[PDB]
Design a protein around this nucleic acid. Structure first.
Ligand code: NA
Ligand code: NA
Ligand code: NA
Ligand code: NA
Ligand code: NA
Ligand code: NA
Ligand code: NA
Ligand code: NA
Ligand code: NA
Ligand code: NA
Lengths: 122, 122
RNA sequence: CGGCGAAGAACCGGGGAGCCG
RNA sequence: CGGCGAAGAACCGGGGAGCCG
């Protein structure tokens, strides 16, 4: 219905909040790219460890290529309800449709656990 | 002072008007590049037959590089008093800092005699 | 019609956080 | 204090006349 086509699975809210929290914390020791241009290049260049996509992107066409791209490059991705939260999580002043963790820093294990839960959705 | 350093020699008013009438005619006969970006490239690419530099360009750094470039590339150049005149003559709606003839069309004689006039000064 | 635009519109690639009053 | 900016600022490269209300 209201959700655009590019949202391919439901991410429980607690999993979303863990993921947003880890994305904000990874900036302290690892490296994130933020925004759809850099997110897309991060995946295309083989650099993405975890891609975040906001569910409320409108027009959906801005991020709609990302899930199929991630799947082709075997990059895990997770949805978050709000591009506002996503922009806050990555530390910028405007909404953010998509982001990528590219260096996991000190959070390798927590991101690993999160990725295995994502897999467990489908 | 008041003219910027890039005005390396004086050009008389009969000649600047000669140069601007010629420029306006070469448009429907040959080819003109208009604007500093296109004029620099024409000189660098070896395509410029006559470049026009307005004397009232503020800031001067917009065009200051052009005279030594023209000399390096063996390209004659002429100063005209007004970038508004220069704009009107290349048929655009805004001021124009510099321009270049790239083909003389059917006005090869009037161009040559002006070029020899230019050579005569300094 | 005004405002802006060759001191470089649109558009494209690089870039990745400031620009303006 | 506002307006705008990750739906991509500044800037570099290509482009060469439109963009906006
Ligand atoms: Na980019
Ligand atoms: Na890593
Ligand atoms: Na760890
Ligand atoms: Na022309
Ligand atoms: Na031109
Ligand atoms: Na250019
Ligand atoms: Na102008
Ligand atoms: Na100008
Ligand atoms: Na880019
Ligand atoms: Na350019």
């Amino acid at each position: 219905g209201p959700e655009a086509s590019y949202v391919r699975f439901e991410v429980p809210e607690d999993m979303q909040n863990e993921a947003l929290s880890l994305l904000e914390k990874v900036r302290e020791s690892g490296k994130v790219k933020k925004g759809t241009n850099e997110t897309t290049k991060a995946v295309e260049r083989g650099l993405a460890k975890l891609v975040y996509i906001a569910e409320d992107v409108d027009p959906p066409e801005i991020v709609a290529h990302l899930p199929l791209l991630c799947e082709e490059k075997n990059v895990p991705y997770i949805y978050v309800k709000s591009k506002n939260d996503l922009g806050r999580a990555v530390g910028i002043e405007v909404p953010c449709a998509s982001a990528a963790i590219i260096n996991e820093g000190e959070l390798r294990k927590e991101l690993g656990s999160l990725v295995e839960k994502i897999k467990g959705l489908q």
